[PDB]
Protein backbone atom coordinates (compact mmCIF):
# COMPACT_ATOMS: atom_id res chain seq x y z
CA UNK A 1 0.00 0.00 0.00
CA UNK A 2 1.33 3.46 -0.82
CA UNK A 3 0.60 5.94 1.92
CA UNK A 4 0.07 9.61 1.27
CA UNK A 5 2.47 11.70 3.39
CA UNK A 6 -0.38 13.05 5.51
CA UNK A 7 -2.06 9.68 5.96
CA UNK A 8 1.30 8.24 7.09
CA UNK A 9 2.09 11.20 9.34
CA UNK A 10 -1.27 10.73 11.04
CA UNK A 11 -0.72 6.98 11.50
CA UNK A 12 2.82 7.41 12.89
CA UNK A 13 1.58 10.04 15.33
CA UNK A 14 -1.20 7.70 16.48
CA UNK A 15 1.55 5.09 17.06
CA UNK A 16 3.70 7.33 19.24
CA UNK A 17 6.48 8.47 16.91
CA UNK A 18 5.81 12.20 17.35
CA UNK A 19 8.81 13.42 19.32
CA UNK A 20 9.74 9.81 20.18
CA UNK A 21 13.25 10.03 21.70
CA UNK A 22 13.19 13.70 20.71
CA UNK A 23 12.59 13.12 16.99
CA UNK A 24 9.88 15.36 15.51
CA UNK A 25 7.23 13.55 13.47
CA UNK A 26 8.62 14.80 10.15
CA UNK A 27 11.82 12.78 10.61
CA UNK A 28 9.86 9.53 10.55
CA UNK A 29 7.73 10.49 7.52
CA UNK A 30 10.88 11.63 5.69
CA UNK A 31 12.75 8.41 6.51
CA UNK A 32 9.79 6.34 5.24
CA UNK A 33 9.74 8.36 2.00
CA UNK A 34 13.43 7.73 1.27
CA UNK A 35 13.49 4.18 2.61
CA UNK A 36 10.34 2.77 1.02
CA UNK A 37 8.78 5.70 -0.85
CA UNK A 38 5.74 5.19 1.42
CA UNK A 39 5.19 1.59 0.33
CA UNK A 40 4.37 -0.98 3.00
CA UNK A 41 5.32 -3.86 0.66
CA UNK A 42 8.75 -2.35 -0.11
CA UNK A 43 11.73 -4.71 -0.22
CA UNK A 44 15.41 -4.33 -1.07
CA UNK A 45 18.01 -7.08 -1.22
CA UNK A 46 21.36 -5.67 -0.13
CA UNK A 47 24.84 -6.74 -1.28
CA UNK A 48 25.12 -8.84 1.90
CA UNK A 49 22.41 -11.52 2.23
CA UNK A 50 20.21 -9.21 4.31
CA UNK A 51 17.02 -7.77 2.87
CA UNK A 52 15.11 -4.72 4.17
CA UNK A 53 11.35 -4.91 4.62
CA UNK A 54 8.29 -2.69 4.81
CA UNK A 55 7.60 1.03 5.10
CA UNK A 56 10.68 1.49 7.32
CA UNK A 57 12.96 -1.04 5.63
CA UNK A 58 13.71 -3.19 8.67
CA UNK A 59 16.98 -5.17 8.21
CA UNK A 60 16.92 -9.01 8.26
CA UNK A 61 20.42 -9.50 9.69
CA UNK A 62 19.82 -7.41 12.78
CA UNK A 63 16.18 -6.70 13.44
CA UNK A 64 13.77 -9.12 11.87
CA UNK A 65 14.12 -12.77 10.95
CA UNK A 66 13.43 -13.67 7.30
CA UNK A 67 14.98 -17.11 7.76
CA UNK A 68 17.39 -16.63 4.85
CA UNK A 69 19.93 -14.23 6.31
CA UNK A 70 23.25 -15.41 7.76
CA UNK A 71 24.20 -13.83 11.08
CA UNK A 72 20.51 -13.04 11.82
CA UNK A 73 20.16 -11.49 15.30
CA UNK A 74 16.41 -10.78 15.16
CA UNK A 75 16.65 -8.02 17.80
CA UNK A 76 13.03 -6.95 17.25
CA UNK A 77 12.09 -10.56 17.77
CA UNK A 78 9.68 -10.60 14.84
CA UNK A 79 9.43 -12.35 11.44
CA UNK A 80 10.24 -9.93 8.60
CA UNK A 81 7.06 -11.01 6.79
CA UNK A 82 5.12 -9.49 9.69
CA UNK A 83 6.50 -6.10 8.57
CA UNK A 84 4.90 -5.95 5.12
CA UNK A 85 1.40 -4.85 6.07
CA UNK A 86 -1.09 -2.00 5.45
CA UNK A 87 -1.13 -1.56 9.24
CA UNK A 88 2.16 0.04 10.33
CA UNK A 89 2.06 -1.31 13.92
CA UNK A 90 4.70 -4.04 13.68
CA UNK A 91 7.08 -1.75 11.80
CA UNK A 92 6.57 1.15 14.22
CA UNK A 93 7.06 -1.18 17.18
CA UNK A 94 10.30 -2.46 15.77
CA UNK A 95 11.44 1.06 14.85
CA UNK A 96 10.89 2.02 18.51
CA UNK A 97 13.15 -0.85 19.65
CA UNK A 98 15.74 0.35 17.17
CA UNK A 99 15.70 3.95 18.31
CA UNK A 100 16.84 3.56 21.90
CA UNK A 101 18.17 7.13 22.16
CA UNK A 102 18.62 10.48 20.37
CA UNK A 103 21.02 9.16 17.72
CA UNK A 104 18.94 6.13 16.84
CA UNK A 105 17.47 7.42 13.57
CA UNK A 106 20.97 7.00 12.16
CA UNK A 107 19.83 3.37 11.82
CA UNK A 108 18.33 4.48 8.52
CA UNK A 109 21.00 5.50 6.02
CA UNK A 110 18.31 7.25 3.97
CA UNK A 111 17.47 9.42 6.96
CA UNK A 112 21.05 10.33 7.89
CA UNK A 113 21.94 11.33 4.36
CA UNK A 114 18.64 12.58 2.93
CA UNK A 115 16.57 13.86 5.88
CA UNK A 116 19.04 15.01 8.49
CA UNK A 117 19.90 18.63 7.73
CA UNK A 118 16.61 19.22 5.90
CA UNK A 119 13.25 20.70 6.87
CA UNK A 120 11.60 17.39 7.79
CA UNK A 121 8.62 19.31 9.16
CA UNK A 122 7.85 20.25 5.53
CA UNK A 123 6.60 16.70 5.14
CA UNK A 124 3.81 17.25 7.68
CA UNK A 125 2.71 20.87 7.31
CA UNK A 126 -0.82 21.08 5.99
CA UNK A 127 -1.56 17.57 7.23
CA UNK A 128 -4.37 17.23 9.72
CA UNK A 129 -3.06 15.63 12.91
Amino acid at each position, epitope marked *: KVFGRCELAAAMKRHGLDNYR*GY*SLGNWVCAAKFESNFNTQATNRNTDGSTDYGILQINSRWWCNDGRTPGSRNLCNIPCSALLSSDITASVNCAKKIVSDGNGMNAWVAWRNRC*K*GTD*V*QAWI*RGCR*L
Partner: antibody, heavy 116, light 107 residues
Framework: QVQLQESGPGLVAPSQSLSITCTVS????????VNWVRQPPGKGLEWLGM???????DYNSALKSRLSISKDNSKSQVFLKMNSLHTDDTARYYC??????????WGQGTTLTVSS | DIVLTQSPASLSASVGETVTITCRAS??????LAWYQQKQGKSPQLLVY???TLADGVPSRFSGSGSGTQYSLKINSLQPEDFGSYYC?????????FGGGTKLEIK
Protein backbone atom coordinates in the same frame (compact mmCIF):
# COMPACT_ATOMS: atom_id res chain seq x y z
CA GLN B 1 31.86 19.18 22.28
CA VAL B 2 29.41 21.29 20.27
CA GLN B 3 30.73 24.88 20.07
CA LEU B 4 29.83 28.09 18.17
CA GLN B 5 31.65 31.46 18.28
CA GLU B 6 30.75 34.65 16.45
CA SER B 7 33.34 37.06 15.03
CA GLY B 8 32.52 40.49 13.64
CA PRO B 9 33.48 44.12 12.78
CA GLY B 10 32.48 45.62 16.13
CA LEU B 11 31.66 49.13 14.85
CA VAL B 12 30.49 49.59 11.25
CA ALA B 13 29.72 52.72 9.26
CA PRO B 14 25.98 53.15 8.46
CA SER B 15 27.52 54.08 5.11
CA GLN B 16 28.71 50.44 4.87
CA SER B 17 27.76 46.73 5.09
CA LEU B 18 28.01 44.03 7.78
CA SER B 19 29.68 40.61 7.84
CA ILE B 20 29.61 38.24 10.82
CA THR B 21 31.25 34.84 10.99
CA CYS B 22 30.11 31.90 13.12
CA THR B 23 32.83 29.26 13.51
CA VAL B 24 31.45 25.91 14.74
CA SER B 25 33.03 22.64 15.92
CA UNK B 26 31.87 19.32 17.33
CA UNK B 27 29.34 18.77 14.52
CA UNK B 28 28.92 18.88 10.75
CA UNK B 29 27.10 21.87 9.26
CA UNK B 30 25.56 19.43 6.80
CA UNK B 31 23.46 17.83 9.50
CA UNK B 32 22.24 20.79 11.53
CA UNK B 33 20.81 24.22 10.78
CA VAL B 34 22.34 27.43 12.18
CA ASN B 35 20.11 30.38 13.15
CA TRP B 36 21.15 33.99 13.59
CA VAL B 37 19.48 35.88 16.42
CA ARG B 38 20.12 39.40 17.71
CA GLN B 39 19.32 41.29 20.87
CA PRO B 40 19.61 45.08 21.17
CA PRO B 41 21.11 46.12 24.54
CA GLY B 42 18.51 45.59 27.25
CA LYS B 43 15.96 44.25 24.77
CA GLY B 44 14.59 40.90 23.64
CA LEU B 45 15.73 38.33 21.11
CA GLU B 46 14.95 38.91 17.41
CA TRP B 47 15.12 36.14 14.82
CA LEU B 48 17.19 37.12 11.77
CA GLY B 49 17.24 33.93 9.72
CA MET B 50 18.76 30.47 9.30
CA UNK B 51 20.70 28.23 6.96
CA UNK B 52 19.55 24.61 7.03
CA UNK B 53 21.93 21.67 6.94
CA UNK B 54 21.10 21.31 3.24
CA UNK B 55 22.01 24.90 2.44
CA UNK B 56 18.51 26.36 2.06
CA UNK B 57 18.02 29.75 3.75
CA ASP B 58 15.04 31.53 5.31
CA TYR B 59 14.94 35.07 6.64
CA ASN B 60 13.15 37.49 8.89
CA SER B 61 10.43 38.95 6.55
CA ALA B 62 11.08 42.60 7.27
CA LEU B 63 14.89 42.29 7.09
CA LYS B 64 15.08 39.83 4.20
CA SER B 65 16.18 42.45 1.65
CA ARG B 66 19.20 43.42 3.74
CA LEU B 67 20.14 39.93 4.88
CA SER B 68 22.25 37.19 3.33
CA ILE B 69 23.35 34.01 5.14
CA SER B 70 25.67 31.48 3.57
CA LYS B 71 28.19 28.90 4.74
CA ASP B 72 31.26 26.86 3.99
CA ASN B 73 30.63 23.31 5.29
CA SER B 74 34.23 22.20 4.78
CA LYS B 75 35.45 25.17 6.80
CA SER B 76 32.68 24.78 9.40
CA GLN B 77 31.74 28.45 9.07
CA VAL B 78 28.40 30.24 8.68
CA PHE B 79 28.22 33.85 7.55
CA LEU B 80 25.71 36.62 8.05
CA LYS B 81 25.90 39.62 5.74
CA MET B 82 23.64 42.60 6.37
CA ASN B 83 23.50 45.81 4.32
CA SER B 84 21.92 49.27 4.85
CA LEU B 85 23.01 49.53 8.48
CA HIS B 86 20.66 51.71 10.49
CA THR B 87 21.57 52.63 14.09
CA ASP B 88 18.84 50.18 15.12
CA ASP B 89 20.97 47.27 13.98
CA THR B 90 23.08 47.90 17.10
CA ALA B 91 22.85 44.67 19.10
CA ARG B 92 24.57 41.52 20.30
CA TYR B 93 24.46 39.02 17.42
CA TYR B 94 24.33 35.26 18.10
CA CYS B 95 24.48 32.16 15.96
CA UNK B 96 22.89 29.05 17.42
CA UNK B 97 22.72 25.47 16.29
CA UNK B 98 19.32 24.12 15.48
CA UNK B 99 18.77 20.47 16.20
CA UNK B 100 15.39 19.27 15.01
CA UNK B 101 13.48 22.47 15.83
CA UNK B 102 15.25 23.73 18.96
CA UNK B 103 18.30 25.94 19.30
CA UNK B 104 20.35 23.68 21.51
CA UNK B 105 23.73 25.39 21.49
CA TRP B 106 24.40 29.12 21.28
CA GLY B 107 27.55 31.11 20.77
CA GLN B 108 28.44 33.78 23.33
CA GLY B 109 27.60 36.42 20.74
CA THR B 110 29.30 39.44 19.22
CA THR B 111 28.32 43.07 19.84
CA LEU B 112 27.71 45.32 16.86
CA THR B 113 27.39 49.11 16.92
CA VAL B 114 26.10 51.15 13.98
CA SER B 115 28.03 54.45 14.06
CA SER B 116 27.36 57.65 12.02
CA ASP C 1 4.10 35.72 9.94
CA ILE C 2 3.18 34.12 13.24
CA VAL C 3 3.70 36.50 16.15
CA LEU C 4 4.12 35.37 19.76
CA THR C 5 2.59 37.32 22.62
CA GLN C 6 4.41 36.58 25.87
CA SER C 7 2.93 37.72 29.22
CA PRO C 8 3.83 39.03 31.74
CA ALA C 9 6.70 41.37 30.90
CA SER C 10 8.00 41.03 34.50
CA LEU C 11 7.40 38.75 37.47
CA SER C 12 8.46 39.39 41.03
CA ALA C 13 8.55 36.28 43.18
CA SER C 14 10.42 34.62 46.01
CA VAL C 15 12.30 31.34 46.12
CA GLY C 16 9.78 28.59 46.79
CA GLU C 17 6.97 30.25 44.86
CA THR C 18 5.49 28.89 41.68
CA VAL C 19 5.23 31.08 38.60
CA THR C 20 3.66 30.79 35.13
CA ILE C 21 4.46 32.50 31.81
CA THR C 22 2.20 32.36 28.78
CA CYS C 23 2.93 32.63 25.10
CA ARG C 24 0.10 32.67 22.64
CA ALA C 25 0.70 32.51 18.91
CA SER C 26 -1.17 34.52 16.29
CA UNK C 27 -1.56 31.27 14.39
CA UNK C 28 -1.44 27.56 15.16
CA UNK C 29 2.19 26.46 15.72
CA UNK C 30 1.30 22.81 16.25
CA UNK C 31 3.47 22.25 19.36
CA UNK C 32 6.61 23.62 17.82
CA LEU C 33 7.33 25.93 20.73
CA ALA C 34 10.55 26.09 22.72
CA TRP C 35 11.57 28.04 25.80
CA TYR C 36 14.88 29.59 26.74
CA GLN C 37 16.29 31.05 29.91
CA GLN C 38 18.87 33.81 29.78
CA LYS C 39 20.81 35.03 32.79
CA GLN C 40 22.35 38.52 32.92
CA GLY C 41 25.36 38.74 30.61
CA LYS C 42 24.85 35.27 29.12
CA SER C 43 23.46 33.62 25.98
CA PRO C 44 19.99 32.07 25.98
CA GLN C 45 19.91 28.42 27.08
CA LEU C 46 17.37 25.88 25.88
CA LEU C 47 15.00 24.71 28.59
CA VAL C 48 12.03 23.13 26.85
CA TYR C 49 11.37 22.08 23.27
CA UNK C 50 8.36 20.73 21.41
CA UNK C 51 6.16 22.26 24.11
CA UNK C 52 6.73 19.80 26.98
CA THR C 53 10.16 18.15 26.71
CA LEU C 54 12.77 19.36 29.17
CA ALA C 55 16.24 19.80 27.73
CA ASP C 56 18.99 17.64 29.24
CA GLY C 57 19.95 18.79 32.71
CA VAL C 58 16.89 20.98 33.18
CA PRO C 59 15.31 20.47 36.63
CA SER C 60 11.86 18.89 36.66
CA ARG C 61 10.41 21.88 38.50
CA PHE C 62 10.09 23.35 35.01
CA SER C 63 7.18 22.10 32.91
CA GLY C 64 5.81 23.30 29.61
CA SER C 65 2.29 22.87 28.35
CA GLY C 66 0.12 23.98 25.44
CA SER C 67 -1.28 23.20 22.01
CA GLY C 68 -2.57 25.07 18.99
CA THR C 69 -2.11 28.73 19.79
CA GLN C 70 -1.67 28.80 23.55
CA TYR C 71 1.34 27.72 25.59
CA SER C 72 2.84 28.25 29.05
CA LEU C 73 5.99 27.57 31.06
CA LYS C 74 5.52 26.77 34.75
CA ILE C 75 8.33 26.92 37.31
CA ASN C 76 7.36 24.99 40.44
CA SER C 77 9.01 26.21 43.64
CA LEU C 78 11.53 28.38 41.83
CA GLN C 79 15.14 28.56 43.05
CA PRO C 80 17.94 31.20 43.10
CA GLU C 81 19.31 30.04 39.75
CA ASP C 82 15.91 30.49 38.04
CA PHE C 83 15.98 34.27 38.24
CA GLY C 84 16.61 35.89 34.89
CA SER C 85 14.76 36.18 31.57
CA TYR C 86 12.66 33.67 29.61
CA TYR C 87 11.66 33.65 25.95
CA CYS C 88 9.45 31.42 23.94
CA UNK C 89 10.20 30.75 20.25
CA UNK C 90 8.10 28.96 17.64
CA UNK C 91 9.49 26.69 14.91
CA UNK C 92 6.45 26.25 12.70
CA UNK C 93 7.70 26.90 9.19
CA UNK C 94 9.51 30.22 8.65
CA UNK C 95 10.03 32.91 9.63
CA UNK C 96 10.49 31.99 13.28
CA UNK C 97 9.76 34.59 15.98
CA PHE C 98 10.33 34.97 19.74
CA GLY C 99 7.91 36.06 22.45
CA GLY C 100 8.60 39.45 24.07
CA GLY C 101 10.43 37.94 27.03
CA THR C 102 9.69 37.86 30.74
CA LYS C 103 11.98 39.11 33.48
CA LEU C 104 11.67 36.89 36.60
CA GLU C 105 12.94 38.99 39.53
CA ILE C 106 13.61 38.40 43.24
CA LYS C 107 10.88 40.01 45.39
Amino acid sequence: QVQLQESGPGLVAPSQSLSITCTVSGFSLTGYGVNWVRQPPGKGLEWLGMIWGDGNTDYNSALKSRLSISKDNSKSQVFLKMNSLHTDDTARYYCARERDYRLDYWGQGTTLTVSS
Amino acid sequence: DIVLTQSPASLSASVGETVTITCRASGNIHNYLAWYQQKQGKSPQLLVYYTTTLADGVPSRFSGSGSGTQYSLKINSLQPEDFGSYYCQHFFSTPRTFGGGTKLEIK
